Amino acid sequence: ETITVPTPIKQIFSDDAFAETIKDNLKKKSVTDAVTQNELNSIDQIIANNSDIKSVQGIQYLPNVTKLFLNGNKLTDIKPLANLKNLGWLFLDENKVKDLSSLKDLKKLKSLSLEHNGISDINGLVHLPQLESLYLGNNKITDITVLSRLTKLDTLSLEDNQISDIVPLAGLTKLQNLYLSKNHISDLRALAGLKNLDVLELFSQECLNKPINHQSNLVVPNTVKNTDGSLVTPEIISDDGDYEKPNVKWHLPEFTNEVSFIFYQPVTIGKAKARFHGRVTQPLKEVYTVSYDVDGEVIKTKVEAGTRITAPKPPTKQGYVFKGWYTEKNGGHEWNFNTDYMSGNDFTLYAVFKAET
Ligand SMILES: [K+]
């Protein structure tokens, strides 16, 4: 990771664009110019945004770089950065960097930016406990459990991800600038003890419930919670519904496959003011009842319209053998549990038996 003879830039830095970057950094005339290790040692800062760089191979010969600005390139592999022990600032917005193992030994890194890299797994960040400023906006993150180890963070952006569980932030009391817009957040309790916040953003949450059965008289708990745990009153409710604290209630004589409600809550934590607003979406399934009739005695099972019915364990009537489920007590036809899908209405199936030889 050192050169011992004057060596052309183009031989050290194999990516054409990055070689030109080094050339301009050292104020050389040409990527053909030979440079010494002492010149390479002099590089403290590289600014090469939007420069169509595909690889930084060769950067490992720059032991003293402390700030690296590489936003808007085509990087995937940052392995050549792994031994830049003095790296302090590292900006890699708008690349496709996902393997963060190569950051493991950058123990002086204090500011990291990786926005719009398509990242989901940030567990690699546990090796950067000294980190102070972290920007991860516009990624695909759902699990921020690792961040509870990053107790020196005072500036943190997680906006435009898919986060619902912010409890791992609860202990990060040094936090002063916190960006959480455009996630899946419905419960602010984790933020309650962040007494040092100055900037806080909580706009535009989308909160998706697991599906439940549609019903004429539908009741859904309000799950939107303030920093003190109190429920946030809905701002407006779909499908003519009403709020009956703590529940949202609808009258739905006709099936619809979704109801929803919108919420808005001004929030103050320490010195920071924010506006927590968003939408709770509730998918509904259209269900009807299959009555299984065994010689007049009935068991009722709910089934979603248009799906296959899973046949039950068959009845055993001693002295007889079960022959199947039919659409009429006598006659009709046999239900085919593979090709007959659930009707859009209640109906009955009748067990048919044949006496034993
Ligand atoms: K609706």
Curated annotation (Swiss-Prot):
Its main location: secreted. LRR repeats lie at residues 40-62, 63-86, 88-106, 107-128, 129-152, 154-172, 173-196. Residues 285-357 are annotated as: B repeat region. Belongs to the internalin family. It comes from Listeria monocytogenes serovar 1/2a (strain ATCC BAA-679 / EGD-e). Interacts via its LRR repeats plus the Ig-like region with the extracellular portion (residues 25-741) of its receptor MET; MET can bind HGF, its endogenous ligand, and InlB simultaneously. Probably forms a dimer upon interaction with host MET, which subsequently allows dimerization of the host MET and subsequent host signaling; dimerization probably occurs via the convex surface of InlB. Prevention of dimerization does not block interaction with MET but prevents downstream action. Residues 206-284 are annotated as: Ig-like region. The gene is inlB. GO terms for cellular component: cytoplasm; extracellular region; peptidoglycan-based cell wall; plasma membrane. The keyword Secreted applies. Mediates the entry of L.monocytogenes into normally non-phagocytic mammalian host cells. Its host receptor is hepatocyte growth factor receptor (HGF receptor, a tyrosine kinase, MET) which is tyrosine-phosphorylated in response to InlB. Downstream targets MAPK1/MAPK3 (Erk1/2) and AKT are phosphorylated in response to InlB, which also causes cell colony scattering. Complement component 1 Q subcomponent-binding protein (gC1q-R, C1QBP) has been suggested to also act an InlB receptor, but this is less certain. The N-terminus (36-79) resembles a truncated EF hand, the LRR region (80-240) has a curved form, while residues 241-321 form an Ig-like region; the whole region forms a curved tube. The LRR domain alone (31-241) binds mammalian MET and stimulates its Tyr-phosphorylation; the LRR plus Ig-like region (36-321) are required for receptor dimerization; adding the B-repeat allows the protein to scatter host cell colonies, and the GW domains, especially GW2 and GW3, potentiate MET activation. It is found in: Secreted; Cytoplasm; Cell membrane. GO terms for molecular function: heparin binding; lipid binding. Disruption phenotype: Deletion of inlB alone decreases host cell entry; the reduction varies from 99% to 37% depending on the cell line tested. This is Internalin B.
